[PDB]
Design a protein around this nucleic acid. Structure first.
Ligand SMILES: [Mg+2]
Ligand SMILES: [Mg+2]
Ligand SMILES: [Mg+2]
Ligand SMILES: [Mg+2]
Ligand SMILES: [Mg+2]
Ligand SMILES: [Mg+2]
Ligand SMILES: [Mg+2]
Ligand SMILES: [Mg+2]
Ligand SMILES: [Mg+2]
Ligand SMILES: [Mg+2]
Ligand SMILES: [Mg+2]
Ligand SMILES: [Mg+2]
Ligand SMILES: [Mg+2]
Ligand SMILES: [Mg+2]
Lengths: 129, 216, 82, 186, 149, 83
RNA sequence: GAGCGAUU
RNA sequence: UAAAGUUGCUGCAGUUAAAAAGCUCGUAGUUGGAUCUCUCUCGGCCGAAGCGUUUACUUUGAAAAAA
């Protein structure tokens, strides 16, 4: 059965990005997925997306810009303290000049740099670069 | 044609296309040749949209005119039906013709006698001129092809959806391409019909040669 | 291929897909008003009926169920609703 | 005819109640408006000079109101100067339960008493003559949202001129930007 | 895929997007409820009641008309069976297979299918115990099964 | 690209595919840089101006350069809108 | 020209 | 001990090099689809009292032998 929805959405986006497609359809939708896509779009990696509202769980159509190298999910969602973040940055990101780790904190869903600015930890969801 | 009225297709061109049968395709359809098709009638024959054919022909002409030296364009035909048309196109336009066999290594083996470095390539059939198409990918060579309903589009940049089986259709396509190139260059005019008729580009079919020889 | 508007499929594209694989689900069935020649009552019948529908007034078999759709008795007329 | 929850009526509510009494006396819908009543009314400015009246009616009478909706709207628009009159039900909003929430959580909050449910009900009742066939949400590059609502084609001519006042009313009440479209067919 | 079969079919129903009752339907909620009560008193399960309403009376979805589901309407009225219909059907099928199998000792396939059916029965019974629909002592026993249904 | 002082520090800036936005490398010999001529709207002759497109070899091997060139020409107004 | 390669 | 990504949580393998149980059921274990934006009283705005349906998480603070 399907047990992770963000994993399927990110895998579909990555596969469509490898093939040079212009748009991706991901179903089902989820507010976690919407937050993750918003974080990706704020940094210019995807572009505008539209939420198709059927009466059951919704769908998303996402535009692609060709700037995405890799987007992935981390399972299970490990608890990350503010002093252990640099280890995850070294393990997962390609360089220290670009790339983002996505965390769910009590303040909201954000990237690792915004979590350093707000001085909070949380649980790791995924990464993209 | 950027919706310009001067570049629109006229009635005489439509009549020529209908007489030559360029709108008739095969029974098989390629999955990347489906945007140029109109509808499949009975007996399985696919019909080609002539407006999209005209648009693609004009785009190919614009690509050809953009090259400064006319000799940098190479026109290649392997089947006998296209050899005379390619020779006439080269004579009228100034390109370099390759009729008959294409020698492997022409674009890659620089010590051969026939080594050439064209800037553009025009072929009559992707499935029959596949060898010149493959060597284009080795030397950064754009390609123009006269494709059909069932034709692979690998390494083809501008595909002109015509009928490349009949001799009349191939000759008419080459003649119209030459006419459009010359009119865009500013050599012949668009106000009067071209002096040369499209029958000069047709395949002789030496049976017809023998029949005409014994006419008188 | 590499260029397709997923937001705006053509009307013929969405009637060719599976009913669940469309952008928004929509059944292929409908309700119809049927009238038998003997009796004047109009009966509402589901297209993919699974039971024999009898006319209440005159006990006439309006339709017979089959694998996909229910076939109307000879001489009965029907019109789709809405 | 006006029975506010706060028991404090105003001038516009009084005028609309007088108009409802006039319709009771001079029209053929005596029993309907005699049994029915309204809670409140408001007026807003939309479309660069146009004005819209909102009639907040109780929920247990909304279905009965919908029976006469069209005729009542016509009569009201003929009695008043050129405006746009819309009838909307009165939905309660309960705050989301929290750890610091007090004994206001002695009963589980009904799903109908929810911000999203109330917003959907308001959107459905706002365009009542036309049914809602589809909904799309577009997230702009700057993060803002736009709601596109597809309406029925069979009732296009009835409400085609009221789209702008609908987008104004929803923005004034809900606080979101919404647009309306009429797709060809399914 | 199936719980106890390798098949992976996709056949099911697709409800329309609109939840509003169609204009042509003249029936009220009370008339639909009375029809449901009469059909239940005739001795029909909620599934059969829904099928009859869909086929004959043009009632596409009772929950759209009356605002409530068939089983909840029956429970409010009090005309509801003691045990759920799906569990009843599973137990009846198990009883039928067991009655066949006693006269045919060499039918190994019947034994395999009976094991599968009883596994499904145990799953459903545990689920219904969790929801307190069944008392936390109800047990499926082969001897008692004939009297149960 | 550039250091903290803002001075640009690179050998060269590679060009990207117009279809897929991928970087066209130095050893990509299946890439094409094509020019399409512009005509005068009154006469229809060669203006002397052209529009440049670049397609990487990956798209060309996919057989998707035809559609990409067609869409690029439509976007630039070279191809008629009612194509 | 084809194979990481022996090689073809 | 590193080299050993040859014990692999990070981070290995299981068609042919070592390797997936003959097949199915099934308890424990592991994993699990969408959805919901502080409070009266009593005393001097604060003080007492109930908080929180409770946790997990994260950020603080206190207590934490030296070497
Ligand atoms: Mg199973
Ligand atoms: Mg089935
Ligand atoms: Mg060699
Ligand atoms: Mg080599
Ligand atoms: Mg060691
Ligand atoms: Mg190591
Ligand atoms: Mg590592
Ligand atoms: Mg090993
Ligand atoms: Mg082995
Ligand atoms: Mg095996
Ligand atoms: Mg278990
Ligand atoms: Mg969940
Ligand atoms: Mg110590
Ligand atoms: Mg110490």
């Amino acid at each position: 059965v399907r047990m992770n929805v963000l994993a399927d959405a990110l895998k579909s986006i990555n596969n469509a990005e490898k093939r040079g497609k212009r748009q991706v359809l991901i179903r089902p939708c989820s507010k976690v997925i919407v937050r993750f896509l918003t974080v990706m779009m704020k940094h210019g990696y995807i572009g505008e997306f539209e939420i198709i509202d059927d009466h059951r769980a919704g769908k998303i159509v996402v535009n692609l810009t060709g700037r995405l190298n890799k987007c992935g999910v981390i399972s299970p969602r490990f608890d990350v303290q503010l002093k252990d973040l640099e280890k995850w940055q070294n393990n997962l990101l390609p360089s220290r000049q670009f790339g983002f780790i996505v965390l769910t904190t009590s303040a909201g869903i954000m990237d690792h740099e915004e979590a350093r600015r707000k001085h909070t930890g949380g649980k790791i969801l995924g990464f993209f670069f | 044609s950027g919706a310009l009225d001067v570049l629109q297709m006229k009635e005489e061109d439509v009549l020529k296309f209908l007489a030559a049968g360029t709108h008739l395709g095969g029974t098989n359809l390629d999955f990347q040749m489906e945007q140029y098709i109109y509808k499949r009638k009975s007996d399985g024959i696919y019909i080609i949209n002539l407006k999209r054919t005209w648009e693609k022909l004009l785009l190919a002409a614009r690509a050809i005119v953009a090259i400064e030296n006319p000799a940098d364009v190479s026109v290649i035909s392997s089947r006998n039906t296209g050899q005379r048309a390619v020779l006439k196109f080269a004579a009228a336009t100034g390109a370099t013709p390759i009729a008959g066999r294409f020698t492997p290594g022409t674009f890659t083996n620089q010590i051969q006698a026939a080594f050439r470095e064209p800037r553009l390539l025009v072929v009559t059939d992707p499935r029959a001129d596949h060898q010149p198409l493959t060597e284009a990918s080795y030397v950064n060579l754009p390609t123009i092809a006269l494709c059909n309903t069932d034709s692979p589009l690998r390494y083809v940049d501008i595909a002109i959806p015509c009928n490349n089986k009949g001799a009349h259709s191939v000759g008419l396509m080459w003649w119209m391409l030459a006419r459009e190139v010359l009119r865009m260059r500013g050599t012949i005019s668009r106000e009067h019909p071209w002096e040369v008729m499209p029958d000069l580009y047709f395949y002789r079919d030496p049976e017809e040669i023998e029949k005409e020889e014994q006419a008188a | 291929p590499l260029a397709k508007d997923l937001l705006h499929p053509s009307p013929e594209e969405e009637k060719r897909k599976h009913k669940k694989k469309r952008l928004v689900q929509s059944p292929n069935s409908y309700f119809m008003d049927v009238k038998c020649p003997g009796c004047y009552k109009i009966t509402t019948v589901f297209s993919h009926a699974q039971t024999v529908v009898l006319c209440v007034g005159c006990s006439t078999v309006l339709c017979q169920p089959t694998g996909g759709k229910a076939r109307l008795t000879e001489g009965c007329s029907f019109r789709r609703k809405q | 005819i006006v029975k506010p929850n706060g028991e404090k009526p105003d001038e516009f509510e009084s005028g609309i109640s007088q108009a409802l009494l006039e319709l009771e006396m001079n029209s053929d819908l005596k029993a309907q408006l005699r049994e029915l009543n309204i809670t409140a009314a408001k007026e807003i400015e939309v479309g660069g000079g146009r004005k819209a009246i909102i009639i907040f009616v109780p929920v247990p009478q909304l279905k009965s109101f919908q029976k006469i909706q069209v005729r009542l709207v016509r009569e009201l628009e003929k009695k008043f100067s050129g405006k746009h009159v819309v009838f909307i039900a009165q939905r309660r909003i309960l705050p989301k339960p929290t750890r610091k929430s007090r004994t206001k959580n002695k009963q589980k909050r009904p799903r109908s008493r929810t911000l999203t449910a109330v917003h959907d009900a308001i959107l459905e009742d706002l365009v009542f003559p036309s049914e809602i066939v589809g909904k799309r949400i577009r997230v702009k590059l700057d993060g803002s949202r736009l709601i596109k609502v597809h309406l029925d084609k069979a009732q296009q001519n009835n409400v085609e001129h009221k789209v702008e006042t609908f987008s104004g009313v929803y923005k004034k009440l809900t606080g979101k930007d919404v647009n309306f479209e009429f797709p060809e067919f399914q | 895929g199936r719980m106890h079969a390798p098949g992976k079919g996709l056949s099911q129903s697709a409800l329309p997007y609109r939840r509003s009752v169609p204009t042509w339907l003249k029936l009220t909620s009370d008339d639909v409820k009375e029809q449901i009560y009469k059909l239940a008193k005739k001795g029909l399960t909620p599934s059969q009641i829904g099928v009859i309403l869909r086929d004959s009376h043009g009632v596409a979805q009772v929950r759209f008309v009356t605002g409530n589901k068939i089983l909840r309407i029956l429970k409010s009225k009090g005309l509801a069976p003691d045990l759920p219909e799906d569990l009843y059907h599973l137990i009846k099928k198990a009883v039928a297979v067991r009655k066949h199998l006693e006269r045919n000792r060499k039918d190994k396939d019947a034994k395999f299918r009976l094991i599968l059916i009883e596994s499904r029965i145990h799953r459903l019974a545990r689920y219904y115990k969790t929801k307190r629909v069944l008392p936390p002592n109800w047990k499926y026993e082969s001897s008692t099964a004939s009297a149960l249904v | 690209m550039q250091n903290d002082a803002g001075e640009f520090v690179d050998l060269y800036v590679p060009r990207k595919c117009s279809a897929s936005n991928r970087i066209i490398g130095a050893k990509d010999h299946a890439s094409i840089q094509m020019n399409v001529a512009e005509v005068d709207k009154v006469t229809g002759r060669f203006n002397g101006q052209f529009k440049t497109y670049a397609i990487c070899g990956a798209i060309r091997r996919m057989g998707e350069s035809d559609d990409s060139i067609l869409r690029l020409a439509k976007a630039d107004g070279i191809v008629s809108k009612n194509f």
